[PDB]
């Protein structure tokens, strides 16, 4: 949260805390609306930027956020887990029964697919590779190579 | 229109001989995926409205009948093993009860909901 | 509590050539630590505020360099005047100064 | 006039909606390697394989920007969703003649075994040559 | 139960993080599993000792 003077540079305006600079933006004990992250404090600075008009003082006002871990486990951590894991069971049924290990692999990567779509309806569309856009491509990569395991066998 | 074409297409298991074991049981269960499928877009239309309306009602009952129809192959398939005779007649009976429980439900559904 | 471990605590450089002396924070102290050069017999003076800031009539050959945690001040072309003790002080929260530093030629 | 020339990033769109179609249609070229008396598994894999790749298009249908005319990226969609169709297909016609001619059904397994993948990378070439 | 819980999850309103019916869900797909690794077992076990 960077605030500061319009049209008065650093000779005519400049700005400064009220209170010792750790004691001067004051969150409310129960003013943190956050669903998904954690304010973990806050970190007050002063500087001084240089624009087309000249130099100007900027107070910066920084707010820590740590994001919950639980949901995205339980939503997509374990499910592709558990999907993978069923890829890898699928090799202790018997080698003379096709059709069922056929259906079980190709079904599991539909259902990894689904998992992979659902996925990435939350994540915002940046344009490089999440963290879970690793572990989603590796789970993948697996029920996909033990289908073509089966199909070697 | 779809859900009860779902419905009359899970009816389909019980022409089919009880020795496609593969062929009945993943149609009754690829006719519960779509029966789910279509019950989704039912109530997207809606509010989180508290109480049964008439068309999560239709759907809800034609999930029941597609439900009802892949555990009656279940029990069917398990009667095989113990006595043939008496599953001889489950097919006959199941033939005739499905569809009649259906257009009787469809008949008192549309006339109760559009006496009002 | 914010602790200011300066070094080093004694330093010997002759006059001509450009010394520096730093100071580490243990919290973060953004660009809020200040130098004062305080001569024997004398009141401590400030040298830099802010984090890079030259006060009112200290000659430019004094520089600061400012961070979250640590920080330096280059003194170049030292002078025959310019050997005095000097503290680093960070102002982020309740002042609290480090263990200062003598400069000796 | 203050004009700027925006270059849209490639690597999001390759990994949500290339990298998934070409694994599903290199999925469904496994039914070529299953043998021809196999007749369960080979309809699961092709019908699974046009099922998959329909959810995927009807998904990226909903993901990317609603824009009512033809991309580039709906032309891969439809290559993909023939080829599968293709692959299919031939199964069909494989358990077709199989019984008449067992040696004509395997020379067309080999054949498609051999010759899908080549014209995949050749459609792959001539769309990724077209669009850059 | 994987389409249902996606589905829920585009439909329910979107909060980040745990609540009662993700651990509900959850607990259906579990016992989805717990059931599907039951019969592979059964299928693996079967061939050499069918009492088992
Ligand atoms: C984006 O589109 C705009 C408009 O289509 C492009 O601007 C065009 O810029 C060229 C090169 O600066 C201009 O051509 C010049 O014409 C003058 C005539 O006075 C001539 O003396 C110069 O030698 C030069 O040929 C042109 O005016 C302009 N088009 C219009 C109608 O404004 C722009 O280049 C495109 N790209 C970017 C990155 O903006």
């Given at each position: 949260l960077k605030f500061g003077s319009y049209a008065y540079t650093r000779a005519e305006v400049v700005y400064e805390w009220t209170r010792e600079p750790a004691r001067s933006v004051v969150v409310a004990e129960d003013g943190s609306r956050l669903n998904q992250y954690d304010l973990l404090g806050q970190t007050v600075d002063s500087g001084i930027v240089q624009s087309s008009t000249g130099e100007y003082v900027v107070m910066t006002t920084h707010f820590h956020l740590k994001r919950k871990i639980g949901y995205f486990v339980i939503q997509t951590y374990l499910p592709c887990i558990m999907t993978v894991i069923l890829s890898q069971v699928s090799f202790w049924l018997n080698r003379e029964s096709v059709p069922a290990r056929t259906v079980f692999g190709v079904t599991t990567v539909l259902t990894m697919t689904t998992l992979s779509i659902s996925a990435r309806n939350s994540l915002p569309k940046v344009a490089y590779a999440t963290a879970m856009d690793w572990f989603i491509a590796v789970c993948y990569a697996f029920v996909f190579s033990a289908l073509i395991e089966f199909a070697t066998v | 229109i779809p859900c009860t074409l779902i419905v009359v297409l899970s009816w389909v298991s019980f022409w089919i001989n009880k020795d496609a074991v593969p062929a009945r049981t993943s149609l009754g269960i690829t006719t519960v995926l779509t029966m789910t499928t279509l019950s989704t877009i039912a109530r997207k239309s809606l509010p989180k409205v508290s109480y049964v309306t008439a068309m999560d009602l239709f759907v809800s009952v034609c999930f029941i009948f597609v439900f009802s129809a892949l555990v009656e192959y279940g029990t069917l398939h398990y009667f095989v093993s113990s006595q043939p005779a008496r599953a001889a007649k489950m097919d006959s009976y199941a033939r005739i009860f499905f569809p009649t429980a259906f257009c009787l439900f469809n008949l008192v559904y549309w006339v109760s909901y559009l006496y009002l | 509590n914010i602790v200011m471990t300066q070094s080093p605590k004694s330093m010997s450089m002759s006059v001509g050539e450009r010394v520096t002396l730093s100071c580490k924070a243990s919290e973060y102290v953004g660009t809020y630590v200040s130098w004062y050069q305080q001569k024997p017999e004398q009141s401590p003076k400030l040298l830099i505020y802010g984090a890079s800031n030259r006060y009112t009539g200290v000659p430019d050959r004094f520089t600061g360099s400012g961070s979250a945690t640590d920080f330096t001040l280059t003194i170049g072309s030292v002078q025959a005047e310019d050997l005095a003790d000097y503290h680093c002080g960070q102002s982020y929260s309740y002042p609290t100064f480090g263990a200062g530093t003598k400069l000796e030629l | 006039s203050l004009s700027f020339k925006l270059k849209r990033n490639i690597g999001y769109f390759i990994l949500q909606t290339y990298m998934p179609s070409i694994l599903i249609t290199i999925l469904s070229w496994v039914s070529f390697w299953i043998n021809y008396d196999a007749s369960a598994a080979r309809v699961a894999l092709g019908i699974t394989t046009?099922?998959?790749?329909?959810?995927?298009?009807?998904?990226?249908?909903?993901?990317?920007?609603?824009?009512?005319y033809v991309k580039a990226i709906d032309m891969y969609l439809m290559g993909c969703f023939v080829?599968?169709?293709?692959?299919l297909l031939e199964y069909a016609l494989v358990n077709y003649i199989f019984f008449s001619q067992p040696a004509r059904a395997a020379a067309?397994?080999?054949?498609?075994?051999?010759?899908?993948?080549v014209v995949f990378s050749f459609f792959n070439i001539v769309y990724?040559?077209?669009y850059v």
């Open positions: - | - | - | 046009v099922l998959t790749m329909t959810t995927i298009n009807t998904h990226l249908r909903e993901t990317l920007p609603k824009i009512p080829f599968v169709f293709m692959a067309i397994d080999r054949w498609s075994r051999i010759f899908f993948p990724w040559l077209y």
